[PDB]
Amino acid sequence: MAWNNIVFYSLGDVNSYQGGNVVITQRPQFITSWRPGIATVTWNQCNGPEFADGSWAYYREYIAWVVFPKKVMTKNGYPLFIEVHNKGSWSEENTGDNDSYFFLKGYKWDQRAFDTANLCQKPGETTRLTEKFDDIIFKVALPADLPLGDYSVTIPYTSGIQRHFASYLGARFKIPYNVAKTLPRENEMLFLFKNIGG
Numbered sequence: 403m404a405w406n407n408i409v410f411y412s413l414g415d416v417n418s419y420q421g422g423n424v425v426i427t428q429r430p431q432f433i434t435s436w437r438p439g440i441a442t443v444t445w446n447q448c449n450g451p452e453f454a455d456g457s458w459a460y461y462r463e464y465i466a467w468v469v470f471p472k473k474v475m476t477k478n479g480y481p482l483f484i485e486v487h488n489k490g491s492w493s494e495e496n497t498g499d500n501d502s503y504f505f506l507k508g509y510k511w512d513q514r515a516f517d518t519a520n521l522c523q524k525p526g527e528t529t530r531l532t533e534k535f536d537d538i539i540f541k542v543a544l545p546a547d548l549p550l551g552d553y554s555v556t557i558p559y560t561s562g563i564q565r566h567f568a569s570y571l572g573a574r575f576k577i578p579y580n581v582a583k584t585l586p587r588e589n590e591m592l593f594l595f596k597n598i599g600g
């Protein structure tokens with residue numbers, strides 16, 4: 403029978419970005435970059451063989467994901483409104499969700515492969531993801547009642563690659579958006595700025 407194995411490899415990079423001194427009318431920006439590194443399985447769904455031994459054909463479909471919040475609360479209890487400034491080539495999907503942005507990039511599909519590989523790594527197992535993807539530039543709208551002073555906002559978010567292995571040519575799968583937005587948010591963008599007022 404036909405089989406499909408899908409595994410989500412989660413990246414866990416911590417980065418920071420300085421917005422500097424801002425007046426309340428500014429939309430200061432921050433850049434999120436994709437850093438190749440070690441990723442951990444945080445989700446899978448498999449019904450096929452556990453691994454390929456280098457002698458038989460299977461098919462690959464890989465899709466990169468970034469799931470980012472639309473609103474973040476400061477530690478003093480105020481909302482910061484996150485807006486997309488420049489998403490590059492990313493596919494911005496499921497735009498009606500009120501809480502999260504979904505950025506996808508399907509970069510490999512229908513690729514026949516033979517070589518040895520674990521086709522269904524379990525949660526907590528790791529691999530090195532060598533892929534590089536485009537930056538995403540966001541901008542922040544501050545509420546007019548934001549208290550004056552220093553802000554250091556930790557924005558947790560999910561980024562990683564969905565790897566789909568199948569027994570046939572033409573195989574397609576996408577992790578449901580509501581599962582993707584409930585995946586561990588292992589990346590962090592620490593946005594630093596100071597509210598000078600208005």
Ligand SMILES: COc1ccc(O[C@@H]2O[C@H](CO)[C@H](O[C@H]3O[C@H](CO)[C@H](O)[C@H](O)[C@H]3O)[C@H](O)[C@H]2O)cc1
Nearest residue numbers: 463464465493495506507508509510511574575576
């Ligand atoms: C053989 O002919 C083909 C015609 C068109 C194709 O489209 C590509 O399909 C890919 C399938 O993995 C991939 O699409 C995925 O990723 C997109 C975002 O980048 C989007 O989320 C799609 O819904 C998703 O399926 C490529 O991006 C498509 O260009 C493939 C073969």
